[PDB]
Amino acid sequence: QLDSKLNDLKSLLKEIANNIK
Amino acid sequence: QLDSKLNDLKSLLKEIANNIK
């Protein structure tokens, strides 16, 4: 469960990077 | 503890992205 939570939080960085650009 | 530490470090990227924008 913790590994899945970390993986899910990972995509937030990509989403933020896409939004900023 | 290590998983929690990694999760906490994760939010730093989002904070930096918000600050830069």
The string of DSSP codes covering B1-21 is -HHHHHHHHHHHHHHHHHHH-
CB contact at 8 A, B20 and A20: yes
| DSSP three-state, residue A2 | helix
In the numeric block, the tokens 């990972």 are attached to A10
Q: Which chain A residues are closer than 8 Å to B17 by Cβ?
A: 13, 16-17, 20
Residues of chain A with Cβ-Cβ distance to B20 below 8 Å are 20
The resolution of the experimental structure, rounded to one decimal in Å, is: 2.9
Instruction: Indicate the residue type of A7.
Output: N
- What is the rounded end-to-end Cα distance, in angstroms, of chain A? 32
Q: CA of A9: how far to CAs of A14, B6, B8, in Å?
A: 10, 11, 11
Q: How many angstroms separate the CA of residue A4 from the nearest CA in chain B?
A: 11
- What six digits make up the tokens of A20? 């900023």
Give the residue on B whose Cα is nearest the Cα of A12: B14
